Amino acid sequence: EEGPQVKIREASKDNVDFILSNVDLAMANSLRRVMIAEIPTLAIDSVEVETNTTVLADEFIAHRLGLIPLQSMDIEQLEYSRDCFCEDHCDKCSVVLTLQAFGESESTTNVYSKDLVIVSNLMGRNIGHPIIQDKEGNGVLICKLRKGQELKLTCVAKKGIAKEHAKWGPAAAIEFEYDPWNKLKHTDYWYEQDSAKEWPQSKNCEYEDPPNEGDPFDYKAQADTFYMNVESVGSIPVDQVVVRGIDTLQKKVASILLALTQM
C-alpha cells in the first residue's frame, strides 16, 4: 500500500519479529521509543494496608504490586483519574482489587497475583484481570507467609504510561537493527587482526546481499529496512503494542496540527 511496509517473520502471543522497509530511520526509532514509553496501561498505583504481619515492609510489597501486569485490553475505554470528574477514584477511572491471605497451613503459604480479587465494576470491559502465563495459573509470587502471619491490602489500578513509571510499560525489550552488512558504514569495527573474522555475523545477514569486493562506496544509500522484534509483557496483545505504538505517535503529531490551528 505504498509507504512503510511490514513483513512479519515470526509471531506469537509474546513476540512479533518483523521487517520495516521503505521508511526513515527517524520514524522507525520514534515508533521504537513510543512502544517503550507512551502506550497506556492499567497498573496498581495505590495500596491501602489493613494488615501486614508478613516478613516484608508495606512499601516493599506495594512496590511489587505495581509491577504485576494487569489486563489492559480495553484500556482506552478507561479514563485517567486526573481527567475524570469524580473525587479521587471511581469505576469510570479505576479498578479496585483486594488481597487477603492467611498463613493457615504449617507449610509456607505463597501469595500470588491470582489471589487478587477485583471489587469494582468492570462494566463489561476486559480490564484489571491479573495476567497469568505460567504453566500453573499462579502468576507472580507476591509474598510468602509463615503460619500465623497475615496480609490484608486494598489496591487501586489506574491508567498510566511508562514515562511516568516503568510499571506502566507494555513492552519488555525491542530488538532493532539495520544494515547488518556494514554498507552505509555507520560504524567503524574495532579489531585486533581482522574486522570480519572477529565480529559475529548477525541473523539478518541472511536477508541481505553481501557487498561485492570491488564496488566503490555507495554514498547515496540511506537507511531503510529495519529488523525489529517486539516482546509484550502480557498486559496487552503483542500485535497491539505495535499498532497502538503507531497510533499514539499519530495522535501526538495530531495534537500539534491542532495547536497551530487553535493558535
Binding site: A43, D45, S46, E48, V49, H63, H165
Partner: protein, 46 residues
C-alpha cells in the same frame, strides 16, 4: 476488641495503665510492643 500493647514473645495482646510496670501474663518479658494503628496507611505503588 482493642489492644494498646503486645508482648515481645507470647504475642498475647496486653494493655494496662500506670503502676502496672512492664510484664505480660506468665511471660514476664519486660519488653512489650506498641501495636499497629487502625488509621490505615496509603502507599504510592512506585
Amino acid at each position: 476488641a482493642t489492644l494498646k500493647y503486645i508482648c515481645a514473645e507470647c504475642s498475647s495482646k496486653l494493655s494496662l495503665s500506670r503502676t502496672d510496670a512492664v510484664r505480660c501474663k506468665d511471660c514476664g518479658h519486660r519488653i512489650l510492643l506498641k501495636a499497629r494503628t487502625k488509621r490505615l496507611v496509603q502507599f504510592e505503588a512506585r
